[PDB]
Amino acid sequence: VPRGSHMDVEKLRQLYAAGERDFSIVDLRGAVLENINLSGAILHGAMLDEANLQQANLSRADLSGATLNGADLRGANLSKADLSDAILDNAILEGAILDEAVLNQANLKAANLEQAILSHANIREADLSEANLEAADLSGADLAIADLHQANLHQAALERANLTGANLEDANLEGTILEGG
Numbered sequence: 101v102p103r104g105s106h107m108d109v110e111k112l113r114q115l116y117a118a119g120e121r122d123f124s125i126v127d128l129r130g131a132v133l134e135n136i137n138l139s140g141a142i143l144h145g146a147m148l149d150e151a152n153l154q155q156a157n158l159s160r161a162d163l164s165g166a167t168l169n170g171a172d173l174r175g176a177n178l179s180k181a182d183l184s185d186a187i188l189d190n191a192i193l194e195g196a197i198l199d200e201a202v203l204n205q206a207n208l209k210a211a212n213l214e215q216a217i218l219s220h221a222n223i224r225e226a227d228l229s230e231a232n233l234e235a236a237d238l239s240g241a242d243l244a245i246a247d248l249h250q251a252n253l254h255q256a257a258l259e260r261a262n263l264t265g266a267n268l269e270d271a272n273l274e275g276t277i278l279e280g281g
Contacts, residue, residue, distance in 0.1 A: 101126065109133060116141065189227075229267075 101115060102108070107126045115123075116138060123138075125145040134154040138161055146166045155175040163178075167187045174192055179199045189209045193216050202222040210230040220240040229247045235255045245265040255275035273279055 103127075107131070109136070112136075112138075184222075 101120060101123060102111060103125060105127065107128050109128075109131055112123070112126075112128070113136070121140060122142045123146060124142055125147070126143070127147045128151055129147050130150045131148075132152045133156055134152050135156065136153070137157040139157045139159045140161065141158070142162045143158075143166055144162050144164050146163070148163075148171055149167050149169040151168070151171045153171055153173045153176050156173070157177050158181055159177050159179040160181060161178070162182045163186050164182045164184045165186060166183070168191050169187055169189050171188065171191045173196050175195045176193070177197045178201050179197055181198070181201045183198075183201060183203045183206050185205050186203070187207045188211050189207050190211065191208070192212045194212050194214045195216065196213070197217045198221055199217055200220045201218070203226050204222050204224045206223075206226045208226055208228050208231055211228070212232045213236050214232050214234045215236065216233070217237045218241050219237050221238075222242050223246055224242050224244045226243070226246045228243075228251050230250045231248070232252045233256050234252050236253070237257045238261045239257045240260040242262045243266050244262050246263075247267045248271050249267045249269040251271045253276055254272045258276045258278060
């Protein structure tokens with residue numbers, strides 16, 4: 101498993117296919133990882149900034165502490181993945197599936213999560229300031245003490261979501277269970 105040098109995507113595929121799951125701290129910056137299946141991979145602390153992860157299968161992956169600044173995760177599946185303490189500022193997660201993921205203390209400033217599925221996710225203390233959550237499914241999610249200032253939650257599903265202590269200043273709440281309240 102290459103460490104200290106940039107990981108080739110073909111090498112990553114071969115290793116995963118051989119049964120390897122520990123890709124902690126690997127350097128995949130800018131890598132073209134679209135459609136890759138890395139389900140269950142350990143990517144703890146990995147450098148995935150700017151990566152193309154369109155429609156990647158990252159279900160049950162451990163991405164805790166990884167850096168994903170500006171990464172393209174459009175349509176990726178992160179069901180039950182761990183993204184605690186990850187950095188996803190300015191990442192693109194449109195249509196991504198993060199059902200039952202954990203994102204506690206993640207950084208998602210100005211991330212695009214339009215139409216993302218975050219049902220029953222742990223999103224406690226995340227920075228979602230200026231994020232786009234238009235039509236995102238946050239059903240039953242925990243956003244305790246999250247920063248949502250200036251976030252777009254237009255038509256988001258906040259039913260049964262916990263927003264206790266969250267910063268909702270200048271957030272768009274039109275179409276949600278909170279509209280008009």
